[PDB]
Amino acid sequence: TVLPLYSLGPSGQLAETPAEVFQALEQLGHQAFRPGQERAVMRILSGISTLLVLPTGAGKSLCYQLPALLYSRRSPCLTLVVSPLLSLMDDQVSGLPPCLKAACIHSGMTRKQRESVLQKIRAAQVHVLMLTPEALVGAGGLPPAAQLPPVAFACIDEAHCLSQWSHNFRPCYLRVCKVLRERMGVHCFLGLTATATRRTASDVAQHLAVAEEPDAPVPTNLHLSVSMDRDTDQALLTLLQGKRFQNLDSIIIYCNRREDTERIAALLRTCLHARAPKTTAEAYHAGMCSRERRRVQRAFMQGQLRVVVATVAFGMGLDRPDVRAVLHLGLPPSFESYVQAVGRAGRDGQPAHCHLFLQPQGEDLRELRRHVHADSTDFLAVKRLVQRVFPACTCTCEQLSHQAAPGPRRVCMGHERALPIQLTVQALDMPEEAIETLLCYLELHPHHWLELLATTYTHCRLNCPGGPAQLQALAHRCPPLAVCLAQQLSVEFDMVKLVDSMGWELASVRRALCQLQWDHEPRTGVRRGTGVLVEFSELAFHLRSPGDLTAEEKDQICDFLYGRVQARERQALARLRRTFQAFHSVAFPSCGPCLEQQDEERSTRLKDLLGRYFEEE
Ligand SMILES: [Zn+2]
Numbered sequence: 001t002v003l004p005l006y007s008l009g010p011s012g013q014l015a016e017t018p019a020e021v022f023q024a025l026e027q028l029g030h031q032a033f034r035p036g037q038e039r040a041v042m043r044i045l046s047g048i049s050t051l052l053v054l055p056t057g058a059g060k061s062l063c064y065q066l067p068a069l070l071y072s073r074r075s076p077c078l079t080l081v082v083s084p085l086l087s088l089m090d091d092q093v094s095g096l097p098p099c100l101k102a103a104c105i106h107s108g109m110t111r112k113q114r115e116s117v118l119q120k121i122r123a124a125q126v127h128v129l130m131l132t133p134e135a136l137v138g139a140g141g142l143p144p145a146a147q148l149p150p151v152a153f154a155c156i157d158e159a160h161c162l163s164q165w166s167h168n169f170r171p172c173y174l175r176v177c178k179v180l181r182e183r184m185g186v187h188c189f190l191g192l193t194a195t196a197t198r199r200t201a202s203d204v205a206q207h208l209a210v211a212e213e214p215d216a217p218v219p220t221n222l223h224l225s226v227s228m229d230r231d232t233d234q235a236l237l238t239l240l241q242g243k244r245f246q247n248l249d250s251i252i253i254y255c256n257r258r259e260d261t262e263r264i265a266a267l268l269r270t271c272l273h274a275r276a277p278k279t280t281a282e283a284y285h286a287g288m289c290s291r292e293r294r295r296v297q298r299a300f301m302q303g304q305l306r307v308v309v310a311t312v313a314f315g316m317g318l319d320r321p322d323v324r325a326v327l328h329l330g331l332p333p334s335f336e337s338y339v340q341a342v343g344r345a346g347r348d349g350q351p352a353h354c355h356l357f358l359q360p361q362g363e364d365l366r367e368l369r370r371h372v373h374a375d376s377t378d379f380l381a382v383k384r385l386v387q388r389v390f391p392a393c394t395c396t397c398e399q400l401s402h403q404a405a406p407g408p409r410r411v412c413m414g415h416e417r418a419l420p421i422q423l424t425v426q427a428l429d430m431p432e433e434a435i436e437t438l439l440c441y442l443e444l445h446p447h448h449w450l451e452l453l454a455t456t457y458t459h460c461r462l463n464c465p466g467g468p469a470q471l472q473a474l475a476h477r478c479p480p481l482a483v484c485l486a487q488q489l490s491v492e493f494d495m496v497k498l499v500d501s502m503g504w505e506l507a508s509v510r511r512a513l514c515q516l517q518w519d520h521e522p523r524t525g526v527r528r529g530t531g532v533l534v535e536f537s538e539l540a541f542h543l544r545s546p547g548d549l550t551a552e553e554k555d556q557i558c559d560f561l562y563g564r565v566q567a568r569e570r571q572a573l574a575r576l577r578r579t580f581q582a583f584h585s586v587a588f589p590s591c592g593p594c595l596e597q598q599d600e601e602r603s604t605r606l607k608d609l610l611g612r613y614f615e616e617e
Pocket of ligand 1 (some may be wrong): 393394395396411412414546548
């Protein structure tokens with residue numbers, strides 16, 4: 001357990017910022033605190049959770065780097081930074097003193113990667129660990145907090161994903177905070193987000209147990225325009241050659257599909273072929289390997305590449321000052337996504353120009369709507385999922401393998417079940433993220449009892465060289481194997497069925513089964529290998545739910561979950577309509593009128609619309 005670095009003064013007020021923090025701040029490279037950074041850093045150094053909403057992505061890294069540096073100087077500890085896979089996909093390396101490491105899904109070394117990082121942690125050669133959310137609550141997960149150094153605090157990047165009001169709600173973020181509190185000892189969180197309304201930011205503060213406090217107006221030097229050209233490719237060439245854009249040398253163009261980035265980049269390179277030396281345009285999307293993305297971003301940072309054509313999803317994790325223009329080929333899916341992308345231009349006070357090309361026949365809004373309706377879960381899927389999660393048990397009425405008679409009725413104390421992910425996805429026609437979402441909906445509800453224990457392998461297969469006689473000979477070493485061989489009038493079975501029927505823990509069953517690779521020589525001990533093969537498979541949700549629900553109670557559960565599915569859909573549709581209405585209300589038929597100078601009345605009117613959207617509760 002890590003004690004707070006700084007202690008509160010009398011009456012509970014924050015202690016005055018010491019000299020040490022400033023020294024550390026200079027050491028990292030930044031020579032000044034951005035607004036709200038000094039207070040937030042002092043909060044974490046005192047053990048107080050805090051939410052920080054930043055207008056631009058710049059300065060987000062310093063908020064966890066300075067406390068991690070100071071927490072690690074006092075006593076060997078570890079700071080967890082949770083951020084999406086895109087953030088760690090390309091081996092990002094920060095300041096050297098921290099000695100950071102990343103464990104993510106993309107790491108294709110399996111336990112070797114995680115253990116090498118674990119072994120590096122054990123050698124104190126790691127003080128900041130960056131985990132994608134899926135790695136923290138996935139199959140591999142993290143070792144117990146006892147094996148790990150004590151955690152000073154956890155930084156939650158993209159904290160808006162916790163709230164059902166944000167543009168990008170991800171239920172696994174609810175699981176992350178739960179595991180960090182229960183499995184780990186983390187009760188001091190730093191929430192970092194760059195895009196959130198007052199309704200979303202206040203909801204995140206509820207989840208992180210942060211006191212509410214005011215903490216993104218679009219800058220005055222950004223000049224916005226919107227048009228509905230007939231041919232977007234032709235219009236893009238016409239706009240970039242106009243006087244408003246022809247002398248801007250740092251442009252980002254956001255596209256919907258990544259096949260489009262390579263086409264637009266190749267188009268600009270051929271139609272603008274000509275001080276004199278520098279590269280015109282390069283595509284930047286997630287399909288490219290890690291090397292080519294690093295080079296493209298490096299070239300853009302060094303002013304050697306004029307245009308980067310990227311997808312909205314990959315976007316630009318890089319922050320560069322004096323970015324001159326941001327263009328959108330297609331309606332953005334939300335105000336948050338637009339302001340984030342546009343907020344990258346004009347970091348210096350110098351003027352920056354942004355133009356959005358709406359699809360003339362409205363096909364971009366129709367595609368976004370088609371996606372929302374496709375992500376909706378059918379009611380039959382919700383009904384079939386509830387039946388699989390709350391199946392009837394024999395506690396209140398043979399059916400049980402080890403009962404010859406029903407026996408006296410009992411009050412159901414819950415059962416542990418394995419919901420196989422791949423099997424349920426193909427049987428119910430719903431993706432894994434939707435199943436996870438509905439399970440998270442049920443756990444949060446107070447009246448409905450469900451526990452999402454873990455995501456792990458629950459199926460076990462045992463192949464024997466000696467056939468059936470060799471497997472029977474090992475029944476004295478493994479009580480789980482003993483009850484299986486009796487039930488059977490290569491063997492595989494469900495390990496969570498064993499858990500519930502014999503009262504064991506899933507780990508205890510897993511240990512005893514893999515102990516089947518050792519045998520004791522009759523003379524002495526000299527444990528030697530049995531040669532049996534033990535393989536775990538069928539990744540599943542490990543649940544704990546009652547088995548005594550009536551049909552009426554299951555129906556009420558379905559109405560709850562389906563109501564949440566429809567309300568999430570009505571919210572996503574309402575966000576699309578409100579987003580299109582704003583850009584259209586300010587749009588021209590072509591980019592001709594804004595080839596020379598933007599319309600200040602129109603640019604100001606749009607910037608005021610966005611401002612009132614985020615200042616709303
Ligand atoms: Zn029961």
